[PDB]
Swiss-Prot record:
This is Spectrin alpha chain, non-erythrocytic 1. The gene is SPTAN1. Like erythrocyte spectrin, the spectrin-like proteins are capable of forming dimers which can further associate to tetramers. Interacts with ACP1. The chain holds residues 967 to 1025 of 2477 of the full protein. Morphologically, spectrin-like proteins appear to be related to spectrin, showing a flexible rod-like structure. They can bind actin but seem to differ in their calmodulin-binding activity. In nonerythroid tissues, spectrins, in association with some other proteins, may play an important role in membrane organization. Belongs to the spectrin family. Residues 1-59 form the SH3 domain.
Amino acid sequence: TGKELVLVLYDYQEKSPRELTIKKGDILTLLNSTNKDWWKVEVNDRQGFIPAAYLKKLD
């Protein structure tokens, strides 16, 4: 944690190797948001990509 924190708007399910699965209601740590459609977050044990649209930057 510590850095940018994000809110998961809807619970997402990974569809490919680079992605992660997240649940609506969770505040996770944001690792990378340079890409417009995919943002790297961190949940429980590992890091990975989920739709940038599924996340709200909590600044």
